[PDB]
Amino acid sequence: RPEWLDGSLPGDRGFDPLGLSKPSEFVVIGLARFRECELIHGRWAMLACLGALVAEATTGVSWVEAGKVELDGASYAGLSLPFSITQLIWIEVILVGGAEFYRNSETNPEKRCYPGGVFDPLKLASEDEERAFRLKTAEIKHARLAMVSFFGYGVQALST
Amino acid sequence: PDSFWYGPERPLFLGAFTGEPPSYLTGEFPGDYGWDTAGLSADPETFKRYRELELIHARWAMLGALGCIFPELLGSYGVPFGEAVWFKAGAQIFQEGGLDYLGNPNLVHAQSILAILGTQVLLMGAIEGYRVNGGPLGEGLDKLYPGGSFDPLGLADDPDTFAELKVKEIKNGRLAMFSMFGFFVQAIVTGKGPLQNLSDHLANPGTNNAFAYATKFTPQ
Amino acid sequence: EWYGPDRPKFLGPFSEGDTPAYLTGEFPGDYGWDTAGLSADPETFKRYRELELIHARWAMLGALGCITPELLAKNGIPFGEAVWFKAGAQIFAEGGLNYLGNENLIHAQSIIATLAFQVVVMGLAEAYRANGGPLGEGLDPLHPGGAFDPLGLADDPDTFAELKVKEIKNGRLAMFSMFGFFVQAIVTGKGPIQNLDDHLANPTAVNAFAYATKFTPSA
Ligand code: CHL
Ligand code: CHL
Numbered sequence: 001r002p003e004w005l006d007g008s009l010p011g012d013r014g015f016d017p018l019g020l021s022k023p024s025e026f027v028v029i030g031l032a033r034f035r036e037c038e039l040i041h042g043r044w045a046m047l048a049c050l051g052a053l054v055a056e057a058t059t060g061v062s063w064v065e066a067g068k069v070e071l072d073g074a075s076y077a078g079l080s081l082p083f084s085i086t087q088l089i090w091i092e093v094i095l096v097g098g099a100e101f102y103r104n105s106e107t108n109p110e111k112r113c114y115p116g117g118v119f120d121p122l123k124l125a126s127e128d129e130e131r132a133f134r135l136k137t138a139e140i141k142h143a144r145l146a147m148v149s150f151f152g153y154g155v156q157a158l159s160t
Numbered sequence: 161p162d163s164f165w166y167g168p169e170r171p172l173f174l175g176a177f178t179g180e181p182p183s184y185l186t187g188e189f190p191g192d193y194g195w196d197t198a199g200l201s202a203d204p205e206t207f208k209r210y211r212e213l214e215l216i217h218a219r220w221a222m223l224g225a226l227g228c229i230f231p232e233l234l235g236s237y238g239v240p241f242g243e244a245v246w247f248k249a250g251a252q253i254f255q256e257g258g259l260d261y262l263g264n265p266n267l268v269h270a271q272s273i274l275a276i277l278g279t280q281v282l283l284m285g286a287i288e289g290y291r292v293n294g295g296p297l298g299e300g301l302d303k304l305y306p307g308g309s310f311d312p313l314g315l316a317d318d319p320d321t322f323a324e325l326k327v328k329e330i331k332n333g334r335l336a337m338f339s340m341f342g343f344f345v346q347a348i349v350t351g352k353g354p355l356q357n358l359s360d361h362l363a364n365p366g367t368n369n370a371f372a373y374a375t376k377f378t379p380q
Numbered sequence: 381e382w383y384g385p386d387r388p389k390f391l392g393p394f395s396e397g398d399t400p401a402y403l404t405g406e407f408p409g410d411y412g413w414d415t416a417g418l419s420a421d422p423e424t425f426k427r428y429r430e431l432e433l434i435h436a437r438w439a440m441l442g443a444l445g446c447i448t449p450e451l452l453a454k455n456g457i458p459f460g461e462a463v464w465f466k467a468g469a470q471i472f473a474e475g476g477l478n479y480l481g482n483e484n485l486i487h488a489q490s491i492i493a494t495l496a497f498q499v500v501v502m503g504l505a506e507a508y509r510a511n512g513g514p515l516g517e518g519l520d521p522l523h524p525g526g527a528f529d530p531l532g533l534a535d536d537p538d539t540f541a542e543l544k545v546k547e548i549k550n551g552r553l554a555m556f557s558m559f560g561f562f563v564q565a566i567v568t569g570k571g572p573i574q575n576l577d578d579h580l581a582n583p584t585a586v587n588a589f590a591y592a593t594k595f596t597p598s599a
């Protein structure tokens with residue numbers, strides 16, 4: 001087991017062959033940030049995977065094809081929408097930029113990764129030390145599974 | 161407080177002819193002109209309940225007046241509403257195309273009145289239950305002026321400005337309630353939209369006034 | 381349960397946050413609904429309670445009297461007019477107003493005679509109720525008991541209080557239903573039983589909203 005794999009974190013599995021998180025001595029002449037990055041990437045991966053599966057199931061159009069029909073005519077769940085591509089992209093950039101800009105303005109990395117608060121409706125977090133950690137491991141594991149699944153979907157999209 | 165609208169020197173509803181206002185109307189509340197000739201606020205509890213009723217009515221009627229005026233103006237300018245007139249907008253749901261916000265077939269496009277009524281009942285019941293008894297957006301706040309999450313811009317931090325804005329709110333609300341009573345009566349009598357009535361009055365003020373309908377409800 | 385500070389209220393979970401202080405809960409049907417503040421003075425509260433109970437009893441009787449003839453006519457009783465709001469014109473009929481159709485019952489013809497008799501009788505009865513007369517004097521204004529409780533069904537005070545709660549609740553329901561009767565007769569123009577039958581025939585299509593543009597202003 002690697003020494004820098006100190007444990008006490010949900011994603012501890014002893015997988016770091018290249019020593020990316022391994023501290024190194026320095027001469028003049030961090031794990032929290034990487035965990036946050038994996039968390040965010042995995043969250044978006046599960047969101048994308050669920051959305052692609054639901055879109056394939058309900059309307060039947062390919063996820064790779066989505067966007068071409070939308071540009072010709074906007075429609076969600078078979079119901080038309082009165083939005084052009086310009087208004088769509090403007091609204092998207094404004095809202096996402098606002099959410100991002102509020103997201104990164106947190107001096108505390110623990111709250112940066114795990115804001116809780118209003119984003120947790122049920123009092124599931126509380127102060128538990130085992131069940132909360134177990135569900136946190138569950139989130140990180142499903143995040144990894146969704147990331148690899150979406151990478152497989154992207155690979156299969158090419159050359160097909 | 162020490163301002164033109166509070167204390168024994170506040171303006172009163174009959175000018176110099178008002179005399180002395182009633183004793184219980186000491187002038188410590190916004191919009192206190194000392195007009196309680198009927199004597200319905202002798203009991204302080206009843207006075208407080210009437211104040212709450214007046215404020216809620218004022219806010220609702222301000223919203224109602226704005227929402228009665230705006231769609232008719234837009235429809236007159238050219239926007240293709242289903243029914244621009246305020247007292248006819250409710251019947252749009254019975255049309256074949258259903259209710260269309262701003263006249264667009266992709267905006268709302270409601271079809272069933274029952275769903276609208278049910279969702280409105282649920283949402284408004286929750287809203288008013290939260291208003292009466294503290295909910296997620298504040299628990300221990302004032303009944304009429306909760307502030308906090310309902311004053312995001314911080315326009316009521318200064319107590320003097322707070323009192324001034326309270327007076328302005330109550331005056332605008334009373335004006336709006338008077339105008340909404342006018343809306344109801346004009347709709348019953350004339351049968352046209354308020355903007356149509358205004359345009360008709362402006363076209364010929366000498367003859368296009370209320371007295372033209374005076375002989376409308378005479379018995380025969 | 382019922383009387384007591386921990387009593388059911390008119391807004392459920394949203395009511396205990398704000399209830400009138402003068403509504404302690406010592407009277408039947410106290411759900412703590414006085415948002416308008418009309419019963420701050422205890423004397424006015426007592427008068428309003430009296431008015432409410434009288435309306436409740438009258439509306440119970442009115443609801444039964446509105447429903448029974450129409451149902452009986454549906455069962456096949458030859459009534460002059462089943463609908464309650466057209467039942468008063470039977471006195472102007474050529475054959476007169478006959479109880480249960482049969483011309484040997486009552487067979488009233490004149491409206492003035494019955495109106496005068498009712499005026500005299502009800503005047504005496506209501507004067508006795510207001511002041512006190514042969515049927516007891518100085519009794520409870522709302523629940524005299526005694527000769528007005530021949531069966532003695534409310535001798536036990538707790539049972540008496542529970543029956544009072546049942547009375548006021550049934551009365552509030554009856555008054556609400558009678559207001560519904562008035563509004564439906566004004567709008568639909570048919571009897572309440574006809575309204576129920578029509579609604580049961582096509583619940584989604586025919587309802588109140590169908591008569592929504594009934595009173596739209598003309599011109
Ligand atoms: C000095 C003269 C002066 C006079 C005469 C009045 C008079 C009035 N002020 Mg006051 N004010 C005056 C000075 C001032 N007021 C105010 C500020 C206010 C405010 C904020 C308010 C008033 C209001 C009132 C009204 C209160 C009484 C009422 O309800 O009338 C009711 C009776 C009438 C109006 C007379 C009846 C009208 C008509 C002659 C008869 C109708 C004929 C119809 C054809 C018949 C009906 C048809 C039927 C069949 C349907 C009354 C019209 C209140 C108000 O506007 O209520 C309406 C009010 O809110 N005043 C200020 C600023 C400080 C004043 C400064 O001097
Ligand atoms: C927790 C949810 C809850 C809510 C929201 C309510 C709310 C209510 N309860 Mg309560 N209750 C609730 C739980 C409970 N209640 C009770 C026991 C009682 C009793 C005994 C009574 C009430 C009554 C009431 C009503 C008080 C009247 C009112 O406030 O008018 C505000 C409400 C409205 C104005 C409704 C408006 C409906 C719609 C949105 C508007 C209609 C639009 C029209 C088309 C407009 C058309 C215009 C026309 C006229 C031209 C109100 C609907 C009283 C009642 O029934 O009076 C009617 C009553 O007697 N409740 C119990 C047992 C412990 C409860 C348990 O949780």
Ligand code: CLA
Binds near residue numbers: 190193199337341
């Ligand atoms: C439902 C609305 C409503 C309510 C509850 C109140 C309540 C109150 N007002 Mg406000 N007021 C209103 C509408 C209302 N007012 C309107 C529309 C105006 C402008 C005309 C005013 C102008 C006004 C002034 C200038 C003053 C008050 C004052 C008061 C207080 C004492 C009077 C009283 O006992 O009210 C009891 C009220 C009712 C029981 C409501 C009865 C409504 C009836 C049924 C309507 C029909 C009558 C009406 C005249 C119809 C014609 C309308 C229009 C043509 C005149 C009390 C808190 C005085 C005060 O102390 O301020 C704090 C004061 O100085 N009010």
Ligand code: CLA
Binds near residue numbers: 412418428431553
């Ligand atoms: C004329 C009939 C009448 C009378 C005199 C009263 C009187 C009273 N009721 Mg009762 N009540 C009634 C009808 C009546 N109520 C009806 C129909 C219901 C069912 C909705 C109730 C349900 C009810 C509850 C649940 C409670 C009371 C309570 C009270 C007391 C305090 C409230 C108050 O000040 O009322 C004063 C009443 C008036 C001044 C009458 C004025 C009526 C005006 C004209 C409006 C009527 C029309 C109106 C628009 C109808 C809207 C609703 C409609 C859909 C039916 C008081 C003794 C509370 C209490 O303390 O119990 C002892 C209490 O907890 N009542």
Ligand SMILES: CC1=C[C@H](O)CC(C)(C)[C@H]1/C=C/C(C)=C/C=C/C(C)=C/C=C/C=C(C)/C=C/C=C(C)/C=C/C1=C(C)C[C@H](O)CC1(C)C
Binds near residue numbers: 250
């Ligand atoms: C002061 C005093 C004193 C002495 O002592 C005694 C006496 C005289 C009694 C008193 C007086 C009083 C008065 C005057 C009152 C009045 C009131 C009013 C008018 C109200 C209104 C009030 C009014 C109001 C609320 C209104 C409201 C409105 C609304 C909601 C509306 C809504 C809407 C809209 C938007 C439009 C659409 O399409 C539809 C609808 C949905 C329909």
Ligand SMILES: CC1=C[C@H](O)CC(C)(C)[C@H]1/C=C/C(C)=C/C=C/C(C)=C/C=C/C=C(C)/C=C/C=C(C)/C=C/C1=C(C)C[C@H](O)CC1(C)C
Binds near residue numbers: 436444464467555
């Ligand atoms: C609670 C509260 C609180 C806050 O604070 C304020 C407020 C809101 C104001 C309040 C409320 C109130 C209310 C709701 C009330 C209502 C009432 C009613 C409905 C009554 C009725 C009532 C009703 C009634 C009596 C009724 C009655 C009836 C009758 C007699 C009838 C009779 C008859 C009959 C049999 C049939 C035939 O063929 C004819 C005749 C002979 C005609």
